[PDB]
Write a protein that binds this ligand. Structure first.
Ligand SMILES: Nc1ncnc2c1ncn2[C@@H]1O[C@H](COP(=O)(O)OP(=O)(O)O)[C@@H](O)[C@H]1O
Ligand SMILES: [Mg+2]
Ligand SMILES: [Mg+2]
Ligand code: NA
Length: 158
């Protein structure tokens, strides 16, 4: 749908952009879980942007990618946020087993790395975040996939 292209000159800027993006997702206050697919090569900054989003809205503590556990649950001032790294998801099937269930059926926010691995089982994304990189700079394209995605992108305006 609508798109945003945003230059991120350095890591501080990535963290500031995560805080602004996560603040928009909280303020929208949706009943449906917000699906965010974080895309980009290894080292592009998907986990650093996730860190800026969670720490930016108040998480205190390390943001450890869930390499083997696949999903990490956060409770931030009462909002449930789920960070997924699906790289080691053998088959999407394994998803219907683990606790995924309740996470996609409540007023949560889900931030997903390697969403391709979950094709079929994972709910469709509301917004894709495609991160490109050069040295210590980045550029992110946000792409809306749903009506909610469109509303998220419109919120970035001035
Ligand atoms: N502008 C920037 N944005 C994000 N990460 C940056 C930036 N500049 C440098 N980095 C570095 O790049 C790495 C990003 O790694 P990570 O967030 O784990 O990536 P991914 O999850 O996509 O594999 C970190 O070591 C980080 O400090
Ligand atoms: Mg990738
Ligand atoms: Mg990562
Ligand atoms: Na993804």
């Amino acid at each position: 749908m609508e798109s945003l292209t945003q230059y991120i000159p350095d890591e501080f800027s990535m963290l500031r952009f995560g805080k602004k993006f996560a603040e928009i997702l909280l303020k929208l206050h949706t009943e449906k879980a917000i699906m965010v697919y974080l895309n980009g090569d290894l080292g592009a900054g998907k986990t650093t942007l996730t860190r800026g989003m969670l720490q930016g809205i108040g998480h205190q503590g390390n943001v450890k990618s869930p390499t083997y556990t696949l999903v990490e649950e956060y409770n931030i001032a009462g909002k449930m946020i789920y960070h997924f790294d699906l790289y080691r998801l053998a088959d999407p099937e394994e998803l219907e087993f683990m606790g995924i269930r309740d996470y996609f059926n409540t007023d949560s926010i889900c931030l997903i790395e390697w969403s391709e691995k979950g094709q079929g089982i994972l709910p469709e994304a509301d917004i894709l975040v495609n991160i490109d990189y050069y040295d210590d700079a980045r550029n992110i394209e946000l792409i809306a996939q749903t009506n909610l995605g469109k509303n998220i992108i419109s919120a970035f305006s001035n």
